[PDB]
Amino acid sequence: AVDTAEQVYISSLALLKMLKHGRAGVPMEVMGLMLGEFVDDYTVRVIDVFAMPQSGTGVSVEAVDPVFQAKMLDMLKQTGRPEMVVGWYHSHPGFGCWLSGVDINTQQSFEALSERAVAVVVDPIQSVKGKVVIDAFRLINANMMVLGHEPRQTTSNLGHLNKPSIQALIHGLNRHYYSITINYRKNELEQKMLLNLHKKSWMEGLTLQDYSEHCKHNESVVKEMLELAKNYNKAVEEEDKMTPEQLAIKNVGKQDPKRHLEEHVDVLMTSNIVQCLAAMLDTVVFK
Amino acid sequence: LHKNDIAINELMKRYCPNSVLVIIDVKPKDLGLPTEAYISVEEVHDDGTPTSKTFEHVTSEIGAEEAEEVGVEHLLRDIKDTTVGTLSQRITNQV
Amino acid sequence: DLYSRYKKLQQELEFLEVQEEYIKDEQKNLKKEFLHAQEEVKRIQSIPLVIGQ
Amino acid sequence: EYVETIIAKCIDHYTKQCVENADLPEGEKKPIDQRLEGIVNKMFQRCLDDHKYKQAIGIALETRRLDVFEKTILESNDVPGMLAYSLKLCMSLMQNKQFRNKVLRVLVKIYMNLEKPDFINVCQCLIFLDDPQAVSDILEKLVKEDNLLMAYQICFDLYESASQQFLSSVIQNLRTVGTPEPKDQTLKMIKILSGEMAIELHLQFLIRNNNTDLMILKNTKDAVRNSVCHTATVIANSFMHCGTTSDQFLRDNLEWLARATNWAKFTATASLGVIHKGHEKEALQLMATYLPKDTSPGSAYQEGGGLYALGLIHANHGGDIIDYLLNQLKNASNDIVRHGGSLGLGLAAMGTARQDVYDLLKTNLYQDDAVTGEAAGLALGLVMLGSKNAQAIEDMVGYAQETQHEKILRGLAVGIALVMYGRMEEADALIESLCRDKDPILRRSGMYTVAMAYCGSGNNKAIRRLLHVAVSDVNDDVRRAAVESLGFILFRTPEQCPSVVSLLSESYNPHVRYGAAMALGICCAGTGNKEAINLLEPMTNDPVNYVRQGALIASALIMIQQTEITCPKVNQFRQLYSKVINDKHDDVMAKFGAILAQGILDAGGHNVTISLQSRTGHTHMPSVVGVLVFTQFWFWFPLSHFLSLAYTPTCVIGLNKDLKMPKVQYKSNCKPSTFAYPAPLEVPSITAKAKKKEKNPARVMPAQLKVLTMPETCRYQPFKPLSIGGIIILKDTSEDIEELVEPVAAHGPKI
Amino acid sequence: LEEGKAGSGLRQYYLSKIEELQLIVNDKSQNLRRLQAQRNELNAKVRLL
Ligand SMILES: [Zn+2]
């Protein structure tokens, strides 16, 4: 009878494998297996994550082929992957990320070997592309109903765990069903390689190709955006001619939610491209 | 680019279809685009040299379709989007 | 007290002068976060949607 | 006009060249013409005809000259006022220590030639210079002067604070001097470095000044939970029962403490270690009497809490049991002798800088474990106070990036953070080089490391990168862990803090609001500035529990030691008292920080308080360490037990003889009803004399030190005029019979 | 003498002008921090969104 403060380490490997697995996450029930290494009691690290072939039965203990699982794990052991399995993941599209009776039964059957049994459910179908915040699931002991539910120390991270604060699943099904916090980790190779790779993904090949395209399109295509921009500017000034009457009568309170200022500032920002690229044309013409 | 790459790529030329070759750097110190698509096709030379495997450079782009942009943007939380205006333009015009 | 107000005041000169580059950093960074969060809440609005009444 | 402008620009350019050439004593010295010295020293001496008692030391310090101020104090009245005003002006100019030590070491030669030596100058200088050559004369003149009463004060305060390793060296410096009045010098040198008399008197008046109420403890038992606040109840009980050794509150029942096998029993035993402190026999005997049957407890948290609690008891004592702690720590055990034994051993061996604890600590952290490596990091940081080992920093920073755990990185982070003390001119390239590290934990370690290194507001450059990384960086770790260094360097002025952190009170993210709440909690602690109190109201109302917890802690650190008649604290008293009754509709941690904040005001029964600096202006090391580790409860909550190391009781001492206790009764010019105790509910224009008797001195506000007036008809009177509060002795002016000696107490909760 | 009232008088007046420059830095910090509170209140508002 002892419990500690565990935290699931999530790198970019399992994240991207859950993003591609989420793209291939058909409404049919899918299967997955997570790997890693156990260094101590209250920490867990995942490194290897792969997918499993779909079946008509779906998420079940019968669909897990022991000769296929042990075969692929042996093929990973003969290679440079000396990590044991740490859990299994899946997707719950539509009906919510909660776990049914079959999922908790195969979880109870699959947790006999690993005491942790990390469970992660990705659902990018109804999740907006703004946030990709994911949550990890855990299994509580049925004999702990008499004592405290979760005697876990370090209650500070619960504020970070309160971000998924849906009012139906967390305390709608919190009985015998809790969760755990999730953190990330990034070394210098992922920071410089992935940062420079993303900056290059938003940059050009030689970085000097598409500059003259806009520098010379300022005289052909942008002129239409400047004339239309002046058409919207006049379309606002026609009301700005009527503004000094009300502003000259009431001067108390604001009724129009439009600011009429930041939009013109943005128009000036779009207009400053000519000024910023004029020096570019000066450098291309000069040398 | 070593000479053995014709024998390494020749296996996937016999068994598999025309294989593309990509040379990258072991250290992320190269400022340029790390990916270069090199097609494995034989070209006729004008000087009269015998026909051999030629690696022609094919242009490449680094883009994500649906989710990898969200995952990378969430893992970084430091990079900025296009953000047309003063800073995103003047940084390119300086560096 | 009379002559000590100069040298004692110099500490307030440095403490108030040091805030210049600080408020520069805040006014130059909080607008970058303003356009970050602004584009983050702006990109939520997607083209595929349902039409009600 | 012309003459005053040419002498004005002549003096301005003169002191400008004196500043440009003051930092370069040797090499490439710029030539100074003699006519400039003539025309500056002419009108300068003209001003020095009478010195006008205002600009002598001012212009004498602005010119940065060697013998410019020695001739000023020759013909001058009120020498102690000129040296006290001199050091007061020198301590307020943000010195760089390059010339302050020279000016002090050259100005301490004038009072020894007078008719009698003063203590305010030698104290206010020895708290800053810390030079061994400045004490060798004053330690040997005590025998030549043959004066016993005057040495007790300087021994009490110099052996009290202002130095740890300088005391560790001066104890053997004075131990060497003397025999290897011979009969009197022996008991003198033995009794001056004892230090247990302060524990005896503090245990005495603090053992007879306790006042407890059933409403607070009954409210804690009514709002106790079995999950989170179980540690808050026992840590609040340890706060209110600190020093008084009142275990009868925990002797009511055993089903409320050992009901769950978890860290709650470790925090309960460590809290018990916070309750009783300063016991050489009742501590080990009290820990051994709990189960002296089989010597095999099923829960090792009692042994770990016994070692950690023992380290809390024997902190900074001369009678350490460390020799037995090595033979007891050598035994192989599971994460309790290593963790609790490492914390207790490092806390008991703090300042010793022994290589033994370094070796066994290294071989204790070589197991790659994060818990014993975190406790080993704290213990190494404590024992390495002032050591500055060469291979230790490079070995720890080399051990940092080669592991994946975070508790080892925070343990070695605080380990390399506390070791940095007095390295203002040394840690520049270390903090500047380690500031750009890829690890956010080590990035916080650079700020926490530079925090204690730049104490005293002596560097206005570090704040550039402190706030630059607090606002510019995207990770909230250095953002909420950044401003603690700002408060640790700007703790001198309480008014200037809310002007620059008021923007951080309501920031963008709640992390900067929480860390800024800790900043307001540590910067204004022990003061009475309302510039944060009037801003506490917007902090306590927000949907985020972070700013609410940090707001209750920041308000709990300011409401202590304050009367209601001075400021209307009814707002924060009512809104803070409504948290324990409103905990049903609040978060689980909001009530934890709520009752944890309520345990601060009731700590010690309003008798003991906290202080960031001493009376002479110098800052206490265990107070800063105790308050920073007290703020480090976010990652590890049981780390808050080090708050007892910062408890500084505010009172007076009039002990004349070591074995004779006199009675001193003064009078205050204020109302006695305004300084009474705020007695809570039951829930079943001038005073004649003060309430301090038999010296049981009660609490005293630092602002009350200016309204005290000693009675003219008092039989006894000290030699030094009692002006400010501190530790002094009494001078027997009558020298007659009936000294009014009082007996000593008997056995009980204490020894 | 006539120095503390004349020399230190013009030096004290110059110190008052320095207090005027510190009043320009002062109220620049005031309005810059109030506008900073406005931008922080708007970005915090879309954060609440
Ligand atoms: Zn389904």
From Swiss-Prot, chain A:
GO CC terms in record: cytosol; cytosolic proteasome complex; extracellular region; ficolin-1-rich granule lumen; nucleoplasm; nucleus; proteasome accessory complex; proteasome complex
InterPro entries associated with the record: JAMM/MPN+_dom, JAMM_MPN+_peptidase_M67A, MPN, RPN11_C
Coiled coil: none
Keywords on record: DNA damage, DNA repair, Hydrolase, Metal-binding, Metalloprotease, Phosphoprotein, Protease, Proteasome, Ubl conjugation pathway, Zinc
Top EC category: hydrolase
Domain MPN, chain residue ranges per copy: 8-143
Tissue expression profile of the protein: Widely expressed. Highest levels in heart and skeletal muscle.
Signal sequence extent: none
GO process annotations (BP): double-strand break repair via homologous recombination; double-strand break repair via nonhomologous end joining; proteasome-mediated ubiquitin-dependent protein catabolic process; protein deubiquitination; protein K63-linked deubiquitination; regulation of proteasomal protein catabolic process; response to ethanol; ubiquitin-dependent protein catabolic process
Keyword Lyase among UniProt keywords: no
Position of sequence motif JAMM motif: 90-103
Protein EC: 3.4.19.-
Location of Phosphothreonine modifications: T243
Modification sites for Phosphoserine: S127, S201
GO molecular function, one term: metallopeptidase activity
Binding residues for Zn(2+): H90, H92, D103
Family affiliation: Belongs to the peptidase M67A family. PSMD14 subfamily.
Family matches, as PANTHER family: EUKARYOTIC TRANSLATION INITIATION FACTOR 3 -RELATED
The protein's name in its UniProt record: 26S proteasome non-ATPase regulatory subunit 14
Lineage: Eukaryota, Metazoa, Chordata, Craniata, Vertebrata
From Swiss-Prot, chain B:
Keyword rRNA processing carried by entry: no
GO MF, one example: protein homodimerization activity
Top-level taxon of the source organism: Eukaryota
UniProt entry tagged with the keyword Cell membrane: no
One Gene Ontology term from the biological process aspect of the record: proteasome-mediated ubiquitin-dependent protein catabolic process
GO cellular component, one term: extracellular region
Positions of crosslink type Glycyl lysine isopeptide (Lys-Gly) (interchain with G-Cter in ubiquitin): K80
Keywords from the UniProt entry: Acetylation, Isopeptide bond, Proteasome, Ubl conjugation
Subunit organization: Component of the 19S proteasome regulatory particle complex. The 26S proteasome consists of a 20S core particle (CP) and two 19S regulatory subunits (RP). The regulatory particle is made of a lid composed of 9 subunits including PSMD7, a base containing 6 ATPases and few additional components. Within the complex, PSMD7 interacts with subunit PSMD4 through their respective MPN domain. Interacts with TRIM5.
Function according to Swiss-Prot or TrEMBL: Component of the 26S proteasome, a multiprotein complex involved in the ATP-dependent degradation of ubiquitinated proteins. This complex plays a key role in the maintenance of protein homeostasis by removing misfolded or damaged proteins, which could impair cellular functions, and by removing proteins whose functions are no longer required. Therefore, the proteasome participates in numerous cellular processes, including cell cycle progression, apoptosis, or DNA damage repair.
Family: Belongs to the peptidase M67A family.
Note: Does not bind a metal ion.
Protein name: 26S proteasome non-ATPase regulatory subunit 7
Organism encoding this protein: Homo sapiens (Human)
Boundaries of the shown chain within the full protein: 101 to 195 of 324
From Swiss-Prot, chain D:
Keywords, alphabetical: Acetylation, Phosphoprotein, Proteasome, Repeat
Top-level lineage group: Eukaryota
Keyword Endoplasmic reticulum: no
GO cellular component, one term: proteasome regulatory particle
Positions of modified residues (Phosphoserine): S685
Leader sequence segment: none
Keyword DNA-binding appears in the UniProt entry: no
Short name of any one Pfam family annotated for the protein: RPN2_N
GO MF, any single term: ubiquitin protein ligase binding
Cited InterPro entries: 26S_Psome_Rpn2, ARM-like, ARM-type_fold, Proteasome/cyclosome_rpt, PSMD1_RPN2_N, RPN2_C
Residue list for modification Phosphothreonine: T179
Modification type N6-acetyllysine: residues: K584
Coiled-coil ranges (or none): none
Positions annotated as PC repeat: 267-300, 305-338, 340-374, 375-409, 411-444, 445-480, 481-513, 515-549, 550-590, 593-625
Biological process according to GO: proteasome-mediated ubiquitin-dependent protein catabolic process; regulation of protein catabolic process
Quaternary organization: Component of the 19S proteasome regulatory particle complex. The 26S proteasome consists of a 20S core particle (CP) and two 19S regulatory subunits (RP). The regulatory particle is made of a lid composed of 9 subunits, a base containing 6 ATPases and few additional components including PSMD1. Interacts with ADRM1. Interacts with ZFAND1.
Family: Belongs to the proteasome subunit S1 family.
Name the UniProt record assigns to this protein: 26S proteasome non-ATPase regulatory subunit 1
Source organism of this protein record: Homo sapiens (Human)
Gene: PSMD1
Swiss-Prot record, chain E:
Compartments it resides in: Cytoplasm; Nucleus
Signal peptide stretch: none
Function: Component of the 26S proteasome, a multiprotein complex involved in the ATP-dependent degradation of ubiquitinated proteins. This complex plays a key role in the maintenance of protein homeostasis by removing misfolded or damaged proteins, which could impair cellular functions, and by removing proteins whose functions are no longer required. Therefore, the proteasome participates in numerous cellular processes, including cell cycle progression, apoptosis, or DNA damage repair.
Family, per entry: Belongs to the AAA ATPase family.
Subunit structure: Component of the 19S proteasome regulatory particle complex. The 26S proteasome consists of a 20S core particle (CP) and two 19S regulatory subunits (RP). The regulatory particle is made of a lid composed of 9 subunits, a base containing 6 ATPases including PSMC5 and few additional components. Component of a complex with USP49 and RUVBL1. Interacts with PRPF19. Interacts with TRIM5. Interacts with NDC80. Interacts with PAAF1. Interacts, in vitro, with the thyroid hormone receptor (in a thyroid hormone T3-dependent manner) and with retinoid X receptor (RXR). Interacts with ERCC6.
Protein name: 26S proteasome regulatory subunit 8
Organismal lineage: Eukaryota, Metazoa, Chordata, Craniata, Vertebrata
Full protein stretch here: 11 to 59 of 406
